Design a protein around this nucleic acid. Structure first.
Lengths: 79, 101, 156, 56
RNA sequence: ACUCUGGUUUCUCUUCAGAUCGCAUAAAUCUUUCGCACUAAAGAUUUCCGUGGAGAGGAACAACUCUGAGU
């Protein structure tokens, strides 16, 4: 932002609140339908778009079951 | 034309901000004469296209409707038409009378 | 929320914590579009319009919309075309502006000083003969032709 | 455009001259505005304005 | 010919609208398409440009010309 976030004040808070309220009011025309459609699309994409984290999420959840002896006896891969 | 017509029959059987659209991208190059020189929309000798100069549009008329009008109208109708044309010419002259330098 | 005379807005513009001004500046393109839409037609000499003068004064948007009766606008356009053809065929020594305005770096001219005083020249209003233009003699030229005729138009 | 309107209302040029100036400031204005480089997509609108100018 | 709920204008809000919502016409993103995409098409999405429907509230001046209705 070209305007530094530093120089704010209570009048700045009031002006920002008024501007944000106006923007939100002017953005609520198709906001409900757009939000519902986007949520449905995200749910659909969740079927074919697993995060790398999600990929190993099931394994990583069960992986914590290894005990301290199990988590310390892991041999070096050189042998 | 003729060779172009035969070639067309055979064919049917088998960065840079360009400002002005070049004439290469234009259409309406038709080999056939019937679809190239077509009779214009002569509105029964009483109308013409829009925008173009009314005097120029009426001057370049086909005169086909005018011949029928002058060979079919009655003598009294001809006199009334002559009076109307005289009135129109007088109006044009009055317009021409207001032009000076 | 009663209105105010434009003189106050003009004085504020000539006179004017940068919070309020910066916050409301986010809608300049809407004001530009409104100004483009509400430009005067050739048939009109001066077209007074209502605007929304911001308290900070960063952007003033013309609240009005250019709603015009279709046949009246078509007639105005046809009369303008006829008058333009006549002027072109008559005033062959036509010197179009065909150049940017002289303010390359000059300050913007004060609309109060150099624009609110000189009476503008006559616009392109084709002559109206009362023999055939009588029913539309007064209704032919106006900023809003039927802004008051209840019988002819819906109203304001 | 606003300055051309002001000049029309300042008595610098005639109303017909103002209409000609507006026609110039709208048609064949891509050279004057130079907005094609900023957004290449506007070149379609510029070509449409050029075609409208040619027809008119 | 008796009477009667029934005035329009205008401002604001909410909600719905795939009807040419608009006899007008843009923008952006993704997707597929041959490139090697202002100069290009297709499918979708989204925001503007501004509408119609209905409801609700408000202030201006018409009170029954009108029409529907109660003869």
């Amino acid at each position: 932002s070209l305007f530094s976030s530093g120089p704010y004040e209570k009048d700045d808070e009031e002006a920002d609140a008024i501007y944000a309220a106006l923007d939100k009011r002017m953005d609520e025309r198709r906001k409900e339908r757009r939000e519902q459609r986007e949520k449905e699309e995200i749910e659909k994409y969740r079927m074919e778009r697993p995060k790398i984290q999600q990929q190993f999420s099931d394994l990583k959840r069960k992986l914590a079951e290894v005990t301290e002896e199990e988590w310390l006896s892991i041999p070096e891969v050189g042998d | 034309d003729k060779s172009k017509e035969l070639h067309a029959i055979k064919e049917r059987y088998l960065r840079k901000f360009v400002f002005e659209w070049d004439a290469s991208e234009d259409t309406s190059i038709d080999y056939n004469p019937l679809y190239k020189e077509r009779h214009q929309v002569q509105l029964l000798g009483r109308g013409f296209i829009a925008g173009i100069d009314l005097k120029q549009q009426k001057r370049e008329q086909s005169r086909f409707y005018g011949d029928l009008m002058e060979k079919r109208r009655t003598l009294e109708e001809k006199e009334q038409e002559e009076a109307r044309l005289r009135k129109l010419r007088k109006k044009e002259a009055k317009q021409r009378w207001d032009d000076r330098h | 929320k009663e209105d105010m005379p434009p003189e106050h807005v003009r004085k504020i513009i000539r006179d004017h914590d940068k919070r309020v001004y910066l916050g409301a500046l986010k809608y300049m393109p809407h004001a530009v579009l409104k100004l483009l839409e509400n430009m005067p037609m050739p048939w009109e000499q001066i077209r007074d319009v209502p605007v929304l003068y911001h308290i900070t004064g960063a952007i003033s948007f013309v609240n009005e919309i250019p709603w015009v009766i279709e046949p009246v606008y078509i007639s105005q356009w046809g009369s303008m075309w006829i008058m333009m053809r006549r002027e072109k065929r008559d005033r062959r020594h036509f010197k179009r502006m065909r150049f940017p305005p002289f303010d390359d770096e000059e300050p913007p001219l004060d609309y109060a000083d150099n624009i609110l005083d000189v009476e503008p020249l006559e616009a392109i209003q084709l002559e109206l003969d009362p023999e055939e233009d009588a029913p539309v003699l007064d209704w032919f030229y106006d900023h809003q032709p039927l802004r008051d005729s209840r019988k002819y138009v819906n109203g304001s | 455009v606003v300055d051309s309107h002001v000049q029309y209302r300042l008595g610098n040029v005639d109303a017909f001259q103002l209409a000609d100036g507006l026609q110039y400031i709208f048609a064949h204005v891509g050279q004057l505005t130079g907005m094609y480089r900023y957004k290449y997509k506007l070149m379609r609108q510029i070509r449409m304005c050029k075609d409208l100018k040619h027809l008119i």
